[PDB]
Symmetry: D5
Subunit: 91 residues, 10 copies
């Protein structure tokens, strides 16, 4: 899964790698589920797809908080922009 040899990577880099690729997978699942919710023609399936989708967001949030706690610049940048008002590009 790593693009550099594991011998040269420090473990904390590998642990953040494990968390990052997890967040990526969760984000992808949210998008895919959301698209299928719009396109589904069976309401019973749409309810399940929507249920799972929203839990993928929870999975991502938990993993992102870990990243914030284990990376100073994740914490800096997330504090600047998350839960803000006014233009995001100027915060």
């Amino acid at each position: 899964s790593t693009h550099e040899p594991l011998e040269v990577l420090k473990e904390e880099t590998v642990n953040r790698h494990r968390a990052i690729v997890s967040v990526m997978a969760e984000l992808e699942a949210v998008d895919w589920y959301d698209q299928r919710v719009d396109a589904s023609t069976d309401p019973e399936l749409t309810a399940i797809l929507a249920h799972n989708r929203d839990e993928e967001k929870e999975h991502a949030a938990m993993t992102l908080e870990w990243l914030r706690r284990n990376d100073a610049k994740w914490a800096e940048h997330l504090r600047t922009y998350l839960f803000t008002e006014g233009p995001i590009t100027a915060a």
Copy 2:
């Protein structure tokens, strides 16, 4: 890009799609840069890789805040866990 045909997708769903794949690319870039920072044996290159890495986190944070503002459940779950103390689970 989209799995489903866009004719059946709502405009907001496609905009959230554009934001989600953006955050995914940022996360992927952060990971790659951090790995190359560890393996690079040229400090001047490492300085550039590290600089870019930390700005991808800014790009991800900006886009993620937009998702929070345009999706109620992103807002719900991010509020539960972000900037918290104690066991994440």
Copy 3:
């Protein structure tokens, strides 16, 4: 998403496609998380990886139940083997 053009596909076929690819993604997520649980050396991350893992199984079970209800042979074959005692190849 689909291999054949949507013009020739039954809607029910496309809905089962949506359910199947979901189960595929859920199973893949279970596998990935479980491997990272074994390899992770940060206990707080392992707890998150393990927690998500087991909820992916819940997502798979729910989506799979829908397939069972909307495809007769999924229902027949799942009933033959699920929650059984003897050897499975029997």
Copy 4:
């Protein structure tokens, strides 16, 4: 194959990996076959595609039962939702 090196993976995790990726391929085969059944314009081929399709479901059911027997939460979540009536999300 695996996303983590096999030295750090537990014996059981790799066996469940082999079972999981098998079910994924079976599910993928069901979907592909079913789409080609809708689009095929040769009835004898359609019969073959449909015949194989339904046996892929049997292959998946067999492997999934093994997962249930070798993973506690697969057993819990599958028992909760499989062979039920009423709203699945409930």
Copy 5:
């Protein structure tokens, strides 16, 4: 699924396409199942993988027979080499 636009492809070509990619998926399934049979450390799983493996070969054989019946050169070349003795490259 196809790759030239279907408007210029003949219906028979697309049906053979549906048959060919099916045989490809069966062959791929045979190979992987066989490898997991060798590597599996759980006897109950090994039986399931091997059972499915040999049925994938059956699925492939059926589709190949269809190809033989619907393509003159498949019929010619398969008759030359299948069920023979002596060096195959002869």
Copy 6:
């Protein structure tokens, strides 16, 4: 080219793997060439694509016969269905 480590695979399993992926590549070439034969608007190129196409079938037939000679169930299933009449699903 294998999920599983080569140390745990039997020699015949790895050799059959080499044959199987070859047949897959040959089958893929047949389908693509045939599609390009239908779509090509240059007859001399079409002649080349068709010539190559039909030789890929020979390559596939030769390799498949080897699988028949080195795998009992490939041999069992192929005689059941190859060079038959009536419904293929029987």
Copy 7:
């Protein structure tokens, strides 16, 4: 299979595309077969893999000649370097 829409591509460009992707597939087949010839531990299979490999080169040579005849710069550059004496980089 083309990266730009077929409406804006000239007929000659799509035919050269069909030839080029064919030569690529043939080249890939030559490389894979040659590697399996080195690794194969079954001489009868090795004979087949070697036979097919060398005919892929013929398929490639035929398709390249067509490219040379239908592209001025393929003809110019191939004439410069093919069947020459001395350092190729000159």
Copy 8:
């Protein structure tokens, strides 16, 4: 991530590899963002995408300058063509 085994690659080659794939990822991000800027129908999102897009260009420029300083032919060819006027092919 490298195509050749790392033991035979020079340290400088691997460092240039790290810089090159980074520039590739930056360029890819610029292209993706620019397309989403045109298609986005949400002004607040478009502002973020465009902001990030233009900073990806800065990341590429810095890494590209490093390549120029650590590769003689990058320096030569970048010297000839960047910040010029008139036909680039001259």
Copy 9:
């Protein structure tokens, strides 16, 4: 080849897309050839790979100059860092 439908993209954006993926392909070729130059055990082939490698850089520079002339921020950021002395950061 594009992610968004071409109907909604500005053609100038599509032309820049054509330029970007070309440079990406050129960069990928430079890296691969350079790795094969280090690993090749045939000197005459190594000469060809090395020759091709250095011309891929020429191809990249030409296409990169076109991007600079047709994108304001390419021109701005390339003016800042190209042909400079001192720490790139």
Copy 10:
């Protein structure tokens, strides 16, 4: 990069592999560039893509000449069809 372990491949085989995948990359660049030449609406860019394209053909011809000199069947088959007048399939 290789399909088989480097431990089992002959040095001559691996070098031919390096040339083959190089020719493949050049051909792919020719095809993509030629398509972008047809679709481009900016003449200054069209000039660059066309220029690069034609040099990729040169890069490919040079590498193919190396293959001709270091592989007997490439030389045999290329001599048969290259620089010929008359039906290629004859």
